[PDB]
Amino acid sequence: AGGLSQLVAYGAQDVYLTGNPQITFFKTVYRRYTNFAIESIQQTINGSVGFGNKVSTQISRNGDLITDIVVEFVLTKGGNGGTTYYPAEELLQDVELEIGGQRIDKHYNDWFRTYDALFRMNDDRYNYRRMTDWVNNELVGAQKRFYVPLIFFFNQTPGLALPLIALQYHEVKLYFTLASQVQGVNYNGSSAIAGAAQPTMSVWVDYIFLDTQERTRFAQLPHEYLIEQLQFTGSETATPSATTQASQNIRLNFNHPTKYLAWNFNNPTNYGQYTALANIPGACSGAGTAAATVTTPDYGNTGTYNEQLAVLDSAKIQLNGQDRFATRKGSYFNKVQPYQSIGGVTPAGVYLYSFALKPAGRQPSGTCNFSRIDNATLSLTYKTCSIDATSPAAVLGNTETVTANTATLLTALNIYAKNYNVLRIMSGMGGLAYAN
Amino acid sequence: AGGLSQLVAYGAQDVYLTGNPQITFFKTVYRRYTNFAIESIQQTINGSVGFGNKVSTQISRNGDLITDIVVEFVLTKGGNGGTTYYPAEELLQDVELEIGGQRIDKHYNDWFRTYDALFRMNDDRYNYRRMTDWVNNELVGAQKRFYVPLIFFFNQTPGLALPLIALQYHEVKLYFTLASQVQGVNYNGSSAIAGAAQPTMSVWVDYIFLDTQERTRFAQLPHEYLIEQLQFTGSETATPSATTQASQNIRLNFNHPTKYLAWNFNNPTNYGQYTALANIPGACSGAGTAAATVTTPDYGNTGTYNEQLAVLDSAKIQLNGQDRFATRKGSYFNKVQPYQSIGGVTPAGVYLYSFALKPAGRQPSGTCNFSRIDNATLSLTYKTCSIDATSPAAVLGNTETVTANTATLLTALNIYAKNYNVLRIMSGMGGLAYAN
Amino acid sequence: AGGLSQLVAYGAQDVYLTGNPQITFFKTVYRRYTNFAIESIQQTINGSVGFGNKVSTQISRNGDLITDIVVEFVLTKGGNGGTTYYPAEELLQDVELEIGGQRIDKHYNDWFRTYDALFRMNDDRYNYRRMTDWVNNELVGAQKRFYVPLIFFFNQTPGLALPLIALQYHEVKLYFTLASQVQGVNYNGSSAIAGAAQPTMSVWVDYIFLDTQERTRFAQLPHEYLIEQLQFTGSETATPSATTQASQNIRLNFNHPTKYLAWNFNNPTNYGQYTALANIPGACSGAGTAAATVTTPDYGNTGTYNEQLAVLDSAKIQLNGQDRFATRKGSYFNKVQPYQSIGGVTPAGVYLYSFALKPAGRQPSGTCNFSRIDNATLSLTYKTCSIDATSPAAVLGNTETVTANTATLLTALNIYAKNYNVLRIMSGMGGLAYAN
Ligand SMILES: *[C@@H]1O[C@H](CO)[C@@H](O[C@@H]2OC[C@@H](O)[C@H](O)[C@H]2O)[C@H](O[C@@H]2O[C@@H](C)[C@@H](O[C@@H]3OC[C@@H](O[C@H]4O[C@@H](C)[C@H](O)[C@@H](O)[C@H]4O[C@@H]4O[C@@H](C)[C@H](O)[C@@H](OC)[C@H]4OC)[C@H](O)[C@H]3O)[C@@H](O[C@H]3O[C@H](C)[C@@H](O)[C@H](O[C@H]4O[C@H](CO)[C@@H](O)[C@H](O)[C@@H]4O)[C@@H]3O)[C@@H]2O[C@H]2O[C@H](CO)[C@H](O)[C@H](O)[C@H]2O)[C@H]1O
Ligand SMILES: *[C@@H]1O[C@H](CO)[C@@H](O[C@@H]2OC[C@@H](O)[C@H](O)[C@H]2O)[C@H](O[C@@H]2O[C@@H](C)[C@@H](O[C@@H]3OC[C@@H](O[C@H]4O[C@@H](C)[C@H](O)[C@@H](O)[C@H]4O[C@@H]4O[C@@H](C)[C@H](O)[C@@H](OC)[C@H]4OC)[C@H](O)[C@H]3O)[C@@H](O[C@H]3O[C@H](C)[C@@H](O)[C@H](O[C@H]4O[C@H](CO)[C@@H](O)[C@H](O)[C@@H]4O)[C@@H]3O)[C@@H]2O[C@H]2O[C@H](CO)[C@H](O)[C@H](O)[C@H]2O)[C@H]1O
Ligand SMILES: *[C@@H]1O[C@H](CO)[C@@H](O[C@@H]2OC[C@@H](O)[C@H](O)[C@H]2O)[C@H](O[C@@H]2O[C@@H](C)[C@@H](O[C@@H]3OC[C@@H](O[C@H]4O[C@@H](C)[C@H](O)[C@@H](O)[C@H]4O[C@@H]4O[C@@H](C)[C@H](O)[C@@H](OC)[C@H]4OC)[C@H](O)[C@H]3O)[C@@H](O[C@H]3O[C@H](C)[C@@H](O)[C@H](O[C@H]4O[C@H](CO)[C@@H](O)[C@H](O)[C@@H]4O)[C@@H]3O)[C@@H]2O[C@H]2O[C@H](CO)[C@H](O)[C@H](O)[C@H]2O)[C@H]1O
Ligand SMILES: *[C@@H]1O[C@H](CO)[C@@H](O[C@@H]2OC[C@@H](O)[C@H](O)[C@H]2O)[C@H](O[C@@H]2O[C@@H](C)[C@@H](O[C@@H]3OC[C@@H](O[C@H]4O[C@@H](C)[C@H](O)[C@@H](O)[C@H]4O[C@@H]4O[C@@H](C)[C@H](O)[C@@H](OC)[C@H]4OC)[C@H](O)[C@H]3O)[C@@H](O[C@H]3O[C@H](C)[C@@H](O)[C@H](O[C@H]4O[C@H](CO)[C@@H](O)[C@H](O)[C@@H]4O)[C@@H]3O)[C@@H]2O[C@H]2O[C@H](CO)[C@H](O)[C@H](O)[C@H]2O)[C@H]1O
Numbered sequence A, B, C: 001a002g003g004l005s006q007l008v009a010y011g012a013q014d015v016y017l018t019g020n021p022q023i024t025f026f027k028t029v030y031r032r033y034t035n036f037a038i039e040s041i042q043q044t045i046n047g048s049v050g051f052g053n054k055v056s057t058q059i060s061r062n063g064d065l066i067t068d069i070v071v072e073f074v075l076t077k078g079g080n081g082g083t084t085y086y087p088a089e090e091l092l093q094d095v096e097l098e099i100g101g102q103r104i105d106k107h108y109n110d111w112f113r114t115y116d117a118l119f120r121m122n123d124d125r126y127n128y129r130r131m132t133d134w135v136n137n138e139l140v141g142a143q144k145r146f147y148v149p150l151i152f153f154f155n156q157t158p159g160l161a162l163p164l165i166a167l168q169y170h171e172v173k174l175y176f177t178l179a180s181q182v183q184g185v186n187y188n189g190s191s192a193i194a195g196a197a198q199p200t201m202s203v204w205v206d207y208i209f210l211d212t213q214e215r216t217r218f219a220q221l222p223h224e225y226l227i228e229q230l231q232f233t234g235s236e237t238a239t240p241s242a243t244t245q246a247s248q249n250i251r252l253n254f255n256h257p258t259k260y261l262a263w264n265f266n267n268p269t270n271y272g273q274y275t276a277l278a279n280i281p282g283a284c285s286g287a288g289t290a291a292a293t294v295t296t297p298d299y300g301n302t303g304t305y306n307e308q309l310a311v312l313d314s315a316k317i318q319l320n321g322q323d324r325f326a327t328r329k330g331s332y333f334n335k336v337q338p339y340q341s342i343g344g345v346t347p348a349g350v351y352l353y354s355f356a357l358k359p360a361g362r363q364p365s366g367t368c369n370f371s372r373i374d375n376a377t378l379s380l381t382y383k384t385c386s387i388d389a390t391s392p393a394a395v396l397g398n399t400e401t402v403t404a405n406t407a408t409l410l411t412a413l414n415i416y417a418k419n420y421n422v423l424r425i426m427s428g429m430g431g432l433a434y435a436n
């Protein structure tokens, strides 16, 4: 009886499962690895740290490899609860990775927002906001230390750790541009906050110290790294109409085998506003009260999952004038494409089309070579922004192809593409195999 | 100092960890794969799309393999906030997969509910409800597009992608039965909603386009696929008593090496009602107010994690009249079995017993061959449904082996079993190795 | 067009991705494994089950291997909503694993709390609280069955399943110490709850039944298992000042290759209180009301993510009087270290420093050999606990290096280290390779 009686229940169908076993689940043999040690070491920042200033850092050569890099910010609130939306993230307006004077990759604050909306999830995503925002209803004057993790290729997996020991004659530098205006810190809307403190900045790089055997191999041998890059093109959204469905074709200027496309429609006035402001809880300042105004967002709750507030009705991609796939609704690129390939949840206003089975995985799993495509076009059709944004009854009770009239503020269209490339390192110098 | 001083701290105990390294964490070699492309292509639906109608689709032969399949529904609300509970999921009452006239698998809406409660989790599970329900407090008349992803074997992993190119002489068809009554869409309780719109349906299949090398291999070579199937038997729950603990033995008519058993006790009147209605927040219409009534649920919040509202007190399985394991409480099959083998959270009223170490994984990891068992029995003991469901003090303050008196409405008992089988494909035809 | 036109877009850059394929994503070959069966079997408990009592269990030899072990508790509430905080977890004050009279590992209730805060996440972590607490606003007299899963080496992965069949001459025993006072069960603060029921205890061990081939191998062959252990040292926190920043150096008495360090500052009066009590929602009894008192916590909401309520300002580790790394703020060890190596979220007051790339993984990925270090020191600097804890305006609006004046109650400092060891099993006896 019990367990033993099930073992005896053996038949011909078990041959496909347990006939002549190859593995066992009850005796794992663990792999032995190369000895190493990790140390997070502070870097020197060249230039004056302040709003709207450009600063740079040349990575010191303390260890053999480098992996994670974190930027530390200390900021002080200028408003009360819900008046900030990822201020530390917005503050890092853009960050450039350079090896031997050659640009390897460059990221932007809006990419950090889009990456977080697509590829982070669950408690990890909430911990990320803890690192970049006030999430405890803090008031005016609250001061907090923030941690912005970089997400370049060697930051995302130790298997791509950048070998400083093999880059003897090439310096590795990071160029930072700090934002000038950050909501809830030094600016409230367009009015500056008097007495707002300048930010203080610190840069920390995690180093790997290798044993003698592997150290000598890294220094003497040539290396090839399959790395990822970011491509970004900022376009102007066609003005959506309250009487007709506007359309638009954007020529895609991308290169290299590309894993996926990701785009959003954002209002440049408000960081992360990817959807239309409306008079429903969390969609505008003072929503559901006598002070409701759809001109100003509920900053702490700028994001939403309500597809009704998204502006894109349908979209498709064309290759040399032919449909790459049949037109799908905007919700397909927001819900189904992340469901099929990511497995998290993406707020409305952020869209994905994946060429890869696993776009979040480092291992390649399907790409499109945009370097071999003469014409690539993103065809867009917008909803009819005819809903009264001040009426919750109208916003919460409407049809698929209409949206709030405040969608006309979503004037900026940001399209991102994540591609692969090869970083060859030999004779103390690094270089990308393909420029375009 | 720092990192380097830890490397020198080397001893005899490090031999088991780093002595003669086999792997390194800092130089990942990625695998090269076969070139391919994905395209989601719309299918033709034969038959009239409407409530209570049967429609079918014969998969067109555009590509070499097929993977994901999504059913698109457009629906209009008939009620306000919290008056729908997975309407798009319920609408797809059952879906049958057929290859060459032979049934390969068949799923049901209640299986989608049970699968979601057991194997989906976190943001992925919330994104799934976004695809199948209104989650933004929408009002009467709100119209939304829904996406119901199929979960047959080739839908769940690209490694089991169905090769249409190798099924030249066998058609692959899907048979859909649409529900007749869906709460919050065309029916409110048992009263039809006047002017309710018929649903519109669309079926999309993702195709894989293979390169010439692999294309020829798939078309000429014989193939064997280790696939999964669903077995379902619907039984009548024994009437639980308010004065004694009712018991019941259900003979299990299952076959094949089975990964796990999953069952629920549901009230057929309400979709997904797996627990007793009670006068506590979220457990009945107007709970905690003067309009509270335990005859009608809070539809938007039909599920619960409160074990007190579950009807099963204890259960065990018997093999040929002998205990397969000692009796455990119903909470064990709801909490511990998912904890030990799934790692998510399952609402009360859904129970699991796993024969596998990893029942959610496609790779087999332990099964029981129900084809070699003459008698398999699920022995059940029910709680004494003697709690006053209208009293929150009684519901929120009671003992282990009692439940709310409204548990007598949980009359339907659905038992599911997930088994393995072999799909052999050769000479343009597919066929299952084992029928029973 | 469509998918097929992308396949033709092939170039020289695709050689690194798809040139001469090694793998395919569309034909997974699953591994065949050794046949087995699982059975959860109840154990005998020696000694009287009660608050403050020590009981033990000698594992019966029903099967070949053992894996998961769960302790079942039945408890009755003595208070209303939010008056319990993981009572089943606290009740299991400490549990010792012993093989042949030799201690293999020993865990504590505070380790369960710290482990849950660091390595559990998402729905799994919420399901764990369902197994160890009331989470449905239950009132006085509610009785619930709880499940405390053990987390020794063979409990966490079946690949380390303890082979009873190979331990013929060594008994495997578990020694439990039950807590004497549990908030919300038999004690309210320091006042006992009259008529509180003694707990009832049950111990269940999951057995693996092996087939003849593998059974004989396990019984005759020598075995080596790479297992993990817990090291714990309890220290007294230096009294933090409201006028200066107190500091403290703790000599670390640890051994073996250690994966990570984890520590907290807790108030022994309240289970899991890792942060200072304050007059903000969820931080003290009756917070935000006329009955607010920072002397008593909101038990149901004892944890927090608000770094302001944490007492540690900065910390670093020293090796033989030299900095192992540069000083970082306490939030770094609470936010960044879990972000970089765990990927969840950790409440404030729990700190991590990892020597491993993946400290939650069983496969070793970097350790420090504390057996080869003569002096290891944790250097601590505390915040100035000068904030008026009774003032929400002061707590929610302050600077980085200050905390609430109630932080002086965080007098206990618990430091944990997770190390590796080798369990050798031969001739029917088990033994650890290294004692220190
Ligand atoms: C994003 O989503 C989150 C999750 O829903 C929101 O948080 C929730 O808000 C609703 C709460 O019920 C829930 O508990 C909370 O989780 C978030 O809302 C915004 O941020 C929260 C923290 C609130 O801000 C706090 O609001 C209270 C203010 O305190 C003042 O309140 C006055 C009524 C008192 O007279 C005055 O003395 C202040 O309070 C005292 O100090 C506070 C800190 C103590 O807690 C309190 O003790 C109890 C007093 O000390 C003794 C805080 O300064 C502020 O940080 C939201 O504010 C809304 O909800 C409050 C419950 C309500 O009181 C607020 O009304 C006040 O402010 C509005 C203007 O905002 C005035 O018109 C009104 O007269 C009153 O003064 C307000 O309804 C925040 O939301 C608001 O501001 C946002 C800014 O982006 C946005 O504009 C939003 O639409 C607004 O609703 C969401 O951002
Ligand atoms: C499942 O769990 C969710 C999470 O807890 C619940 O959502 C929460 O509900 C409590 C809120 O505090 C919280 O913000 C919310 O997240 C969910 O509850 C159900 O769905 C929500 C969205 C509510 O429904 C909305 O309720 C308000 C209705 O609006 C009318 O309200 C009247 C008071 C006004 O006079 C009238 O003008 C309407 O409002 C106007 O229109 C709305 C859309 C605008 O927002 C409002 O502007 C502020 C007005 O415009 C100017 C909406 O139609 C409806 O969709 C829950 O309703 C409960 O909570 C409300 C806060 C409260 O107002 C409700 O009372 C009204 O309805 C009840 C009957 O339902 C009447 O008896 C009462 O007189 C009043 O008219 C109500 O207490 C929903 O819950 C209810 O219905 C459920 C149906 O399955 C179920 O029966 C449940 O027990 C009910 O409580 C949960 O389902
Ligand atoms: C941790 O975080 C959780 C998430 O925020 C909290 O839960 C939330 O609490 C706020 C709610 O709005 C929200 O819905 C809920 O999710 C949690 O709070 C604690 O636990 C919850 C469940 C509440 O406890 C319940 O509170 C109501 C009590 O019922 C009595 O209420 C009286 C007003 C009635 O007169 C009396 O008849 C009782 O109610 C009747 O019985 C209940 C069960 C029925 O539901 C009710 O029907 C509607 C009546 O039956 C007809 C329950 O016994 C108790 O379990 C929190 O309590 C706060 O919030 C309540 C909404 C409010 O009513 C409470 O006030 C009562 O108690 C306080 C003292 O606690 C008295 O001073 C006051 O006069 C009144 O009697 C109270 O404000 C719980 O929080 C409190 O207790 C904690 C103990 O650790 C802690 O001390 C905390 O600070 C307190 O606020 C959080 O723990
Ligand atoms: C947690 O956070 C909450 C906010 O999120 C805090 O509440 C805020 O407090 C400020 C308010 O403006 C705001 O509305 C409120 O949200 C909370 O603080 C404590 O709780 C509140 C409710 C206050 O308690 C009340 O204090 C007044 C007492 O009444 C006496 O007042 C005298 C002036 C009269 O002379 C005397 O007769 C009393 O009044 C009478 O009796 C009361 C019950 C009747 O309602 C009233 O009717 C008109 C009178 O009837 C004859 C109340 O009993 C008590 O409940 C906070 O108290 C502070 O703020 C008050 C506005 C202020 O008046 C208080 O000063 C009085 O008490 C102090 C000692 O506390 C005396 O030294 C002084 O002479 C005066 O008597 C006081 O500044 C509470 O905060 C105090 O106590 C806390 C611990 O309980 C804590 O120690 C804090 O630092 C103290 O400030 C937070 O706990």
Ligand SMILES: *[C@@H]1O[C@H](CO)[C@@H](O[C@@H]2OC[C@@H](O)[C@H](O)[C@H]2O)[C@H](O[C@@H]2O[C@@H](C)[C@@H](O[C@@H]3OC[C@@H](O)[C@H](O)[C@H]3O)[C@@H](O[C@H]3O[C@H](C)[C@@H](O)[C@H](O[C@H]4O[C@H](CO)[C@@H](O)[C@H](O)[C@@H]4O)[C@@H]3O)[C@@H]2O[C@H]2O[C@H](CO)[C@H](O)[C@H](O)[C@H]2O)[C@H]1O
Pocket (backbone or CB within 6 Å): A386, A387, A388, A391, A393, A394, A395, A396, A397, A398, A399, B139, B140, B141, B142
């Ligand atoms: C989508 O957005 C548009 C633009 O914002 C919005 O239309 C605006 O609605 C407000 C109105 O003042 C503006 O003129 C209009 O542009 C639309 O709302 C819905 O469609 C419009 C055309 C109205 O429908 C018409 O109602 C009157 C009725 O005689 C006529 O047959 C019908 O077509 C909206 O109805 C609302 O506004 C009317 C002015 C008002 O009279 C209505 O009250 C009647 O009906 C309600 C129930 O709907 C009864 O409770 C009441 O006693 C009375 O009979 C009503 O307030 C309509 O919105 C309303 O219906 C939709 C679904 O069709 C949703 O449920 C809304 O929540 C609900 O307000 C948006 O859908």
Ligand SMILES: *[C@@H]1O[C@H](CO)[C@@H](O[C@@H]2OC[C@@H](O)[C@H](O)[C@H]2O)[C@H](O[C@@H]2O[C@@H](C)[C@@H](O[C@@H]3OC[C@@H](O)[C@H](O)[C@H]3O)[C@@H](O[C@H]3O[C@H](C)[C@@H](O)[C@H](O[C@H]4O[C@H](CO)[C@@H](O)[C@H](O)[C@@H]4O)[C@@H]3O)[C@@H]2O[C@H]2O[C@H](CO)[C@H](O)[C@H](O)[C@H]2O)[C@H]1O
Pocket (backbone or CB within 6 Å): B386, B387, B388, B391, B393, B394, B395, B396, B397, B398, B399, C139, C140, C141, C142
């Ligand atoms: C489980 O479900 C059952 C069935 O619904 C429920 O019993 C129902 O309770 C309501 C009552 O009207 C029905 O007859 C009964 O079927 C049960 O509740 C609990 O058990 C019953 C037997 C009552 O206990 C008895 O209370 C009276 C007392 O003299 C006697 O010694 C005791 O056994 C429930 O107590 C409630 O209902 C009584 C009618 C009422 O008099 C009680 O008030 C007294 O006690 C309360 C505190 O419990 C005092 O605040 C008050 O001043 C007075 O002294 C009380 O309302 C009992 O429920 C109560 O206790 C349980 C735990 O035992 C829970 O905390 C409840 O939340 C609480 O209401 C359910 O447990």
Ligand SMILES: *[C@@H]1O[C@H](CO)[C@@H](O[C@@H]2OC[C@@H](O)[C@H](O)[C@H]2O)[C@H](O[C@@H]2O[C@@H](C)[C@@H](O[C@@H]3OC[C@@H](O)[C@H](O)[C@H]3O)[C@@H](O[C@H]3O[C@H](C)[C@@H](O)[C@H](O[C@H]4O[C@H](CO)[C@@H](O)[C@H](O)[C@@H]4O)[C@@H]3O)[C@@H]2O[C@H]2O[C@H](CO)[C@H](O)[C@H](O)[C@H]2O)[C@H]1O
Pocket (backbone or CB within 6 Å): A139, A140, A141, A142, C386, C387, C388, C391, C393, C394, C395, C396, C397, C398, C399
């Ligand atoms: C951190 O904790 C400390 C200790 O708890 C706390 O200081 C306590 O604050 C309360 C006060 O009674 C105690 O003496 C003090 O120990 C600190 O709060 C902040 O710093 C102190 C020094 C005060 O600043 C001073 O305010 C008066 C002003 O003339 C002077 O220039 C300024 O330095 C706190 O201000 C509060 O308490 C004062 C007694 C009161 O007069 C203030 O009201 C004035 O300012 C407020 C806005 O700040 C106006 O709305 C009001 O009309 C009036 O002009 C005020 O209540 C100061 O806290 C206040 O400011 C900080 C940021 O500096 C936060 O926003 C607080 O939320 C806010 O209350 C804690 O930061």
Ligand SMILES: *[C@@H]1O[C@H](CO)[C@@H](O)[C@H](O[C@@H]2O[C@@H](C)[C@@H](O)[C@@H](O)[C@@H]2O)[C@H]1O
Pocket (backbone or CB within 6 Å): A387, A388, A389, A390, A405, A406
């Ligand atoms: C969106 O459509 C709404 C309904 O017509 C308008 O109310 C709104 O106009 C804005 O707000 C109103 C109140 C007026 O002040 C307008 O001048 C303003 O542009 C539209 O944005």
Ligand SMILES: *[C@@H]1O[C@H](CO)[C@@H](O)[C@H](O[C@@H]2O[C@@H](C)[C@@H](O)[C@@H](O)[C@@H]2O)[C@H]1O
Pocket (backbone or CB within 6 Å): C387, C388, C389, C390, C405, C406
């Ligand atoms: C923390 O600092 C607060 C502000 O000074 C004090 O109120 C608090 O003192 C406690 O509470 C007050 C109300 C008094 O009762 C004190 O005796 C008590 O110690 C400090 O803990």
Ligand SMILES: [Hg+2]
Pocket (backbone or CB within 6 Å): A319, A324, A368, A369, A370, A373, A376, C006
């Ligand atoms: Hg393309």
Ligand SMILES: [Hg+2]
Pocket (backbone or CB within 6 Å): A240, A241, A242, A385, A386, A404, A405, A406, A407, A408
């Ligand atoms: Hg418009």
Ligand SMILES: [Hg+2]
Pocket (backbone or CB within 6 Å): A006, B319, B324, B368, B369, B370, B373, B376
């Ligand atoms: Hg079986």
Ligand SMILES: [Hg+2]
Pocket (backbone or CB within 6 Å): B240, B241, B242, B385, B386, B404, B405, B406, B407, B408
């Ligand atoms: Hg009953």
Ligand SMILES: [Hg+2]
Pocket (backbone or CB within 6 Å): B006, C319, C324, C368, C369, C370, C373, C376
């Ligand atoms: Hg060390």
Ligand SMILES: [Hg+2]
Pocket (backbone or CB within 6 Å): C240, C241, C242, C385, C386, C404, C405, C406, C407, C408
């Ligand atoms: Hg202090």
